[PDB]
Structure formats: structure tokens, C-alpha cells
Amino acid sequence: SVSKANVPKIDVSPLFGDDQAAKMRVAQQIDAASRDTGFFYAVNHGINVQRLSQKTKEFHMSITPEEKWDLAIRAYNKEHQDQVRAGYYLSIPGKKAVESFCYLNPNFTPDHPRIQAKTPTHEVNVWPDETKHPGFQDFAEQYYWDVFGLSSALLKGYALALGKEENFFARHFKPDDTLASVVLIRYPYLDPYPEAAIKTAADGTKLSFEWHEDVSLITVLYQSNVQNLQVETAAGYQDIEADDTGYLINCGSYMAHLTNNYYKAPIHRVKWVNAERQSLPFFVNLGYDSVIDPFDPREPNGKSDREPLSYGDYLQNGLVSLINKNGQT
Ligand SMILES: N[C@@H](CCCC(=O)N[C@@H](CS)C(=O)NCC(=O)O)C(=O)O
Ligand SMILES: [Fe+2]
Numbered sequence: 001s002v003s004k005a006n007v008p009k010i011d012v013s014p015l016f017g018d019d020q021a022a023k024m025r026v027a028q029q030i031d032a033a034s035r036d037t038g039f040f041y042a043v044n045h046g047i048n049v050q051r052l053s054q055k056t057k058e059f060h061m062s063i064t065p066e067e068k069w070d071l072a073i074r075a076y077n078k079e080h081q082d083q084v085r086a087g088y089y090l091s092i093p094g095k096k097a098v099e100s101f102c103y104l105n106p107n108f109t110p111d112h113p114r115i116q117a118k119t120p121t122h123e124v125n126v127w128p129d130e131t132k133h134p135g136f137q138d139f140a141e142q143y144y145w146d147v148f149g150l151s152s153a154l155l156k157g158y159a160l161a162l163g164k165e166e167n168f169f170a171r172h173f174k175p176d177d178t179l180a181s182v183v184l185i186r187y188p189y190l191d192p193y194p195e196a197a198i199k200t201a202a203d204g205t206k207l208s209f210e211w212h213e214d215v216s217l218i219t220v221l222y223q224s225n226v227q228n229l230q231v232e233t234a235a236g237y238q239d240i241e242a243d244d245t246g247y248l249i250n251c252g253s254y255m256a257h258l259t260n261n262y263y264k265a266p267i268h269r270v271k272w273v274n275a276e277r278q279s280l281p282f283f284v285n286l287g288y289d290s291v292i293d294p295f296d297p298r299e300p301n302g303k304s305d306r307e308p309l310s311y312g313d314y315l316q317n318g319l320v321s322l323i324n325k326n327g328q329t
Helices: 020-035 049-062 065-071 136-161 253-258 311-326
Strands: 009-011 039-043 087-089 099-104 181-187 206-212 218-223 229-233 236-239 247-251 268-271 277-284
Touching (some): 049 099, 049 136, 136 218, 136 247, 206 311
Antiparallel strands (some): 087 099, 099 181, 181 277, 229 236
């Protein structure tokens, strides 16, 4: 009785090459998906996702409680005042099932100018001990650059789809400064599954995480093959089918702002499923000072009555609001 959502599979391959015509055909597909339910799967993206889930499972399953406190964000561990974003997000057995590990740009090192200035939302990543987790940091840092690569190609597709030159977004999405992050989220199988860890939607649907719009320009998501996501449409909440060979793509509210809502940030929520699974989002965030002037591809002159908003401001307020609305993850 819940209908299936329209989530097209788009071969994003041409976005890596120089066939400008082929790129326009991919852009049209992005345009259609963005104006409809606001989700699509990127296929032929070139990333080894099987290796990704394997390396990630090895980490989630071998990290100990000790290590988690030692890596924990400030919300779980008051000693770690600089860890607002990056580090470990603990489960609370009996109360909160989900747990995760977030890391930012590998280039945010101690000598980075934004780290030196202590600019909000910039942090140096924390990692487990190499001997307990051999290869993990290097795997994870490589993965950041692989998915960064996929996201630049996708940003060229969205730029072309909106009537712009292909670097419109991508020129603000740079290795030395992107606020992009990876979150390795573990959703556990639990028996018994704690009721306090299950939320209930107004329509009676059991959830693991409530309705929201994403805090990003776009979101580039790998998940396990366990159906869980629902997107709200004019026909109501519809199920997004799982596909663990592709990346699920959608826009965040930053894109909605820029396009004066021509590409909406789709409202979605995460159904409660009692299954051991992974949700591995890459939040495509720009630079702290990145400002794109808002426009409207539905108006003849392209003008919008929205004001410019720097990415850093959007991100910092956005992530705080998401915590307040939907709880500390
Ligand atoms: N710490 C991250 C941002 C994490 C944002 C977040 O909490 N996303 C929610 C909604 S997209 C989540 O993904 N909830 C669950 C789920 O399965 O999606 C980094 O600093 O940028
Ligand atoms: Fe989301």
C-alpha cells in the first residue's frame, strides 16, 4: 500500500569526458529527475562501492567502546571541544540504535589557514590507531577523493541542466577548501529492538530518522540493499527502492535557495528497519566563503528575489538546526 517513487537510473559516464552533446543529454535527465521527485541513481559512476562497504563494515565491526570514547565528538565527550563535526557519534544501547563516524576534507591539517584561524566548521580529522585499523585512514581518505571526483562530474551535470556553463558549481568545489564530509553510518540489527530508538511518523510509519531537507548543495549517497528511504511527493510519501550498485543523488536546501526552488530540496525520512545496514553519505558542501548569486531558470531574465548566502553561514546554521529539529545523531 505505499507506492514506489520515481527514481530514474542515469548513466553519468559522459560527465567525466569531453562529449559536450552527450553531457547535455545527461543534464536533461538530471533536470527531469530534479523537477519530479528530486531523486535519481547515478550509474556507471566508476567507484568501487563493494570495496567501500567492505572496508566500512570492517571498521564498524572492529572498533571498540574504548576507541569510540577516544574518537568521540563533543556531544558525547566534553573533553573534545574542537570536535563538533568530525569523529565518532555513539549509539546508546536501549535508547539510540544508530552510530557513525564523520570525517572532513583530508586537507584540513594543522597548518591549513582555516584551521589556524579556527574558522567554524573546519576541523582536523581524528582517526583510530593505525595498528588496530590497518589501511583504514588511507582507504577513507582515498574514498573522499574518489567521491569528490564523482561529485564534480555531477556538479557539471546540474550546472548544464540549469542553463549554465559546466563549471558554475564546480569552480566553488575545490580540494583545498571544500566543507564536504563523509559519514559512515551503521544502522544495527537488534534483538530486541528498543522502542525508544524507533520514532513514529504522523501517519503511523515507524522511523529511524524523521522528515527533513538535506543540509548540502547535493548529497551523494551509497546504501546497502535494504529499502528504507521515503520521499514526500504530491502523491504522499513514496518508497525509494534500494540499489547498492549506484549512488542515490538529491539536492539540499542550498540548491533550492540558488535556483529559487526550481530544483527543490526533496523532503525525505528514513523508515525503521531491523537489519544490519550502512548509509554512507557524502554531503557536497562548497567553500566557507563561497557565494553563488541566486537565480531563477523559470524567469525570462533569470532574476530572483532571494539574497546571496555564503556557504559557510548556510552550513553552520543548517547543521545546528537539523540537530535541534531531528535530534543529535
Ligand atoms: N556531521 C555531518 C552532517 C550530518 C548531517 C545529518 O545528520 N544528516 C542526517 C540527514 S541527511 C542523517 O543523514 N540521518 C540519517 C540517515 O539515515 O540519513 C558533517 O558535519 O557534515
Ligand atoms: Fe537526508
